[PDB]
Amino acid sequence: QVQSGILPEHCRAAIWIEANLKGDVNALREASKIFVDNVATFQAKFPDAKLGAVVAFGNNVWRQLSGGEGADELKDFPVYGKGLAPSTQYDLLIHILSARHEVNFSVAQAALAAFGDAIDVKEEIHGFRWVEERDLSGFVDGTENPAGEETRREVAVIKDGVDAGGSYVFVQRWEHNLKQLNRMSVPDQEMMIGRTKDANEEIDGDERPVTSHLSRVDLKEDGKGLKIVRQSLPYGTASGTHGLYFCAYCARLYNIEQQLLSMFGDTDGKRDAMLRFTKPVTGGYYFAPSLERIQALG
Amino acid sequence: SQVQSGILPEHCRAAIWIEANLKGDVNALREASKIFVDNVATFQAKFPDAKLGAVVAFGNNVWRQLSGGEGADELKDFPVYGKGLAPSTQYDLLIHILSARHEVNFSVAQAALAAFGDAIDVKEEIHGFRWVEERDLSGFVDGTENPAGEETRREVAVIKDGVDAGGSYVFVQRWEHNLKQLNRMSVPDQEMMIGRTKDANEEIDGDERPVTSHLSRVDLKEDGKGLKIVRQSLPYGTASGTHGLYFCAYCARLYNIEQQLLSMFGDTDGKRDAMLRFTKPVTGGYYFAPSLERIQAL
Ligand code: HEM
Ligand code: HEM
Ligand SMILES: [Mg+2]
Ligand SMILES: [Mg+2]
């Protein structure tokens, strides 16, 4: 029932396509069915790829396609920090991930064929897992991410109601200034992230700055962590633009927003220390329906 | 005389090519090249399962200065062929990294950039990927008649004796495929354009294909002896944006490559390669890849 791209762990490669609707919103109905059917066919042709994909929709298009039912939390991505985190809300998100980039590429071509000239691609980003699953900063990325299908479902997949089997998705492309990073001592970098670099051990929350990344995003409400399922990957070229393509799924948009309010100064006036070397340049919220809901579009 | 490690490996899944001009004193390339090949050895030691190789190669002007004009008798700036049908974008430095792991290639690319630093101006960085069934993005298998096995590939690509023993000539040319234009062609028309059948990759007899077919352009014999080259080309690009083939070939004789270019681009018999109906080259350069010992003697 859940779209196949939310739950797989440890993908080696991904493709994200962000697009605006140029034509009739009804063109997205048949296109989405064709695409998720294509994904199933590719899974059968390439069983070792552990392929999955997600089609997700921006607020205005999803309100139209759903007749206003459900997706109670969905909204256009606002700026956070009054503009520190920009807003680039689009109509359509396609997320493809697997162990084999060459399979992802074929699936992306299938997606473009399905939607045709109804969509205007705003960016297409090819993510790759780097050495030791580290972000390009050199810090391991993923350690506290929900692990195993059971917990990942609990965090990311809506349990009941009209949206059962769906998920909220957030995507935000960051551009790393690695020269600025390399000007910082390793201890300074470690206090910026909140974990040690080589060994990847958490620095005690009582002993690290409240601006450290972990202090910004490891949030609890009455002892209950506001968890999300991250699917982020490095992207780019060594000599040109490079960074992290951040992607997160959650059964509640709330959990993602609270982390963004924290990181970008809205909650307590303090900003994530990572902004000293990297910055976000896109941002969008999308709703990923269940597969049954996609099939019911037309 | 040891060959650089990136010339001979077969069926690499991923590559990075960096093309750059010299910004500073050519003498800066001496230590930088020695650092780079040492870095390559380090990454081979750290990631034995990547089966990494790399090549540093030099354009005519730079190499004439670094070598004092000795050897590399065939090296020259890449000319335009076909009066401009093949454009010329001769740069000073080529770095070619290939392996089983794109993420290791990326680290090696970063090492190259750190070693050469501001002595170079990067003109393009291209990330190649092997596609399904080793097909070019046109859908045709690419590599079938490439020299196979270390012994034959050495014979074709690696200079055997003299001052340049262990070295090789390199040609790189980036192509931009118009897949929409390709898909307007019937499969039989496409097969007459290439000279092999599409699905089964059977060679079409030379008396059964047009003289403009790719194979008729490049499968050249002189007194019965084929003018062989070692191709390392890979697909590159995004599904929605620029995509094509990054063509790369190694040969102990630049002559073999040039004869094929004169054929493809109309200079030999007034006919040109049928592939120009859907794809076009947008860069072109010749480089000399010295032996590893010669790099140590820089
Ligand atoms: C440049 C952008 C980012 C980079 C390089 C980055 C990197 C990291 C690293 C190195 C960790 C520690 C290891 C781990 O547990 O995964 C981490 C953790 C985490 N990140 Fe980020 N991150 C970025 C952006 C974001 C954003 C935008 C959000 C949320 C809106 C976020 C949410 C989280 C969460 C929830 C954790 C787990 C914290 C914990 O419970 O310990 N990250 N990230
Ligand atoms: C868009 C650019 C190109 C594409 C898509 C392409 C594709 C192909 C394909 C599909 C084959 C047949 C399978 C094989 O034997 O590998 C082939 C063969 C070959 N290509 Fe190309 N190629 C391109 C450019 C070039 C260039 C620029 C050269 C030479 C300068 C070249 C030289 C060769 C050679 C020598 C062969 C082997 C021919 C034989 O002996 O049968 N190719 N190529
Ligand atoms: Mg924690
Ligand atoms: Mg032949």
Residue numbers in the entry:
A (entry chain B): 3 to 300
B (entry chain A): 2 to 299
Study text:
Importantly, a salt bridge between Arg-232 and propionate p7 stabilizes the distal architecture. One narrow channel leads perpendicularly to the distal heme pocket, and its small bottleneck radius of 1.2 Å suggests that it only allows access of H2O2 or small ligands like cyanide. The negative standard reduction potential E°′ of the Fe(III)/Fe(II) couple of −350 mV clearly suggests a pronounced imidazolate character of His-215 in KpDyP. We have demonstrated that the distal hydrogen-bonding network including Asp-143, Arg-232, and several water molecules (W1–W5) as well as the propionate side chains p6 and p7 of WT KpDyP is stable between pH 4.5 and pH 10.0, as is reflected by almost identical HS spectra determined by both UV-visible and EPR spectroscopy. In the case of WT KpDyP, the extraordinary stability of Compound I strictly correlates with very poor peroxidase activities.
The enzyme investigated in this work originates from the human pathogen Klebsiella pneumoniae and belongs to class B. All structures exhibit a dimeric ferredoxin-like fold typical for dye-decolorizing peroxidases, composed of antiparallel β-sheets with four β-strands connected by α-helices.
